[PDB]
Amino acid sequence: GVTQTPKFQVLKTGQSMTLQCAQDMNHEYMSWYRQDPGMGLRLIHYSVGAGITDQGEVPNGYNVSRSTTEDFPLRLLSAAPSQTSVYFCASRRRQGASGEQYFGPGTRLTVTEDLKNVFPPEVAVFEPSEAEISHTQKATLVCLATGFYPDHVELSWWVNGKEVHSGVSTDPQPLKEQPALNDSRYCLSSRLRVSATFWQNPRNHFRCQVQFYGLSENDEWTQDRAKPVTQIVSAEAWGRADCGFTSESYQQGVLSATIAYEIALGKATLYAVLVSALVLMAMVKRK
Amino acid sequence: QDPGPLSVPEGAIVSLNCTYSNSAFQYFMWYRQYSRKGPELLMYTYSSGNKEDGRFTAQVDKSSKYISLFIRDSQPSDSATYLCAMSKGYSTLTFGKGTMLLVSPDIQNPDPAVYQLRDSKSSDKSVCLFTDFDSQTNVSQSKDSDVYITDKTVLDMRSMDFKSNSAVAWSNKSDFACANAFNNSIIPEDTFFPSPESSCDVKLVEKSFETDTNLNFQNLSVIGFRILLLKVAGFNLLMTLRLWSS
Amino acid sequence: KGNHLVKVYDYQEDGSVLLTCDAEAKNITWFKDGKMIGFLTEDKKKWNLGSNAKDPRGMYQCKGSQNKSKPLQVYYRMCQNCIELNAATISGFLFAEIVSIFVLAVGVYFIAG
């Protein structure tokens, strides 16, 4: 299929960028598209053969080059806040023989005005309520990642070291904290629902993980707070029961009984040595 | 192509149609795009008629100048965006903008309620949760600017073969409680607002009791110590009588 | 990365503790406090340490075809033989102590005279 790199990229006004597209099913000719809300897909450039490039519909600000028969990169000369979009790459065999394009996975760009606007998320985890557990006998967990910029997160759930895919619903679009301003931050939520007897075990381990995509080590940071880079942020919980008898307290009972019986056995061996010595002393003094 | 999200009850027949008036095209296709992914080809036809590939079915009308697509046995896993495209014998396929589609499920036994989830001890928020609805209920946005409401989503749990609706509210300020949270929305009568008095079934907690190998070994050691006390105490009581009977 | 390539893989269902060496080779060699302890071919990639309730410690290394890696010190303390001390525990221990010394003292009383 068609592969392209990177997935996510943030850059300031006045910075070049090169993003790659690759292909190996021996097709020959390639295109570039962009996509906006309420505009559809629009063509940028295309290259009908190895060495020949034409123009499309919105080409201002872009540059292409077709050297080999597997690669066709794209360059942004100097980026502006109208370049914020999602960019796709398509491929076909030969010129109307079978009109089946093959699109790649995508690449998201945002163009800010200054690097002081970038922030990582903050994650918290909220444990289910007792009224749901007694009314319906199921439990729901909630994860909130709030307050990040830009919009390049990925969320997951991990139970006992393994990912889960059943019982999860994430919001499709991140929301804005004040939807009237321009450089505003974001927020996003998710759910996990699970049977009641699986939450009542104190041996199970739950966590919500968020992958962020920010700056790198070629950037200038002259600010007091830490440099927002690419990281993973998360939050965790053990299962727990409110009332009754778990396997956490059975251990306490067994330990206390062990120490009590060891002490009593020690006293009984002392008394055995006493009365044995008295009987032996008596039997010696009988002679 | 006409935009606008259209809601379909689950298990129906869906009808989408484009109009290409006017030119003379020859090669037709349809694409599907999920959220935050790329497009993907579904059906490829270039004759007038039908070419079925399962439960998908397309029609072409040359003289009437409209095409169509039909989906039967519509699942909730078809909520996506569908894009019609056409071309000449040459290059430069021409696209339409697309149409969002929504299929909402059957919800056979509703039981609506509003629950107050426990805190976090790491943040200063507190969330409410309004769960399974009957799928006709509309959830409105908030009025204050310190309260956040989300839209309604569907989750599918397959360890019990069950599906549900949900919506989440959260806020920072005081005088926020779950009895006044979804006030701006129209709400069904007799939803279940619970009371703060506790209710903890004790017979349900015994349904998840586990055992390790360490607990087995420690219980058996206690069993051994009880026997040793019986034997040594038998010895002491036998010897304490001989010394005084003499 | 700076020659740090031994990581820990935790929170499994059984209480096992595993270690993954990060190098592209086959026939990975493991060391512990300098001396060799193991031999791991392909189709297994993770060294087993045992359960965490026996709380392992030590300093571990791996090598491939290049030089050795830097150590990693592991330290567990999951206490698992602990007793919380309350009013009830101390009351039971004191009461059992008093009644046992009373029975033994009556026995010595009839022994002596």
């Binding site: 008898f245 009972g253 | 015994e206 105490a233 009581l237 | -």
Partner: peptide
């Protein structure tokens, strides 16, 4: 049933009773 504390407390009653009652029987013989 579940809580084993009742079994230990019940074990600490019958043991002393069974010692004292045994040593009181062999003496009357």
């Amino acid at each position: 049933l579940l809580d084993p504390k009742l079994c230990y407390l019940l074990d600490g009653i019958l043991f002393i009773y069974g010692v004292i009652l045994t040593a009181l029987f062999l003496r009357v013989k």
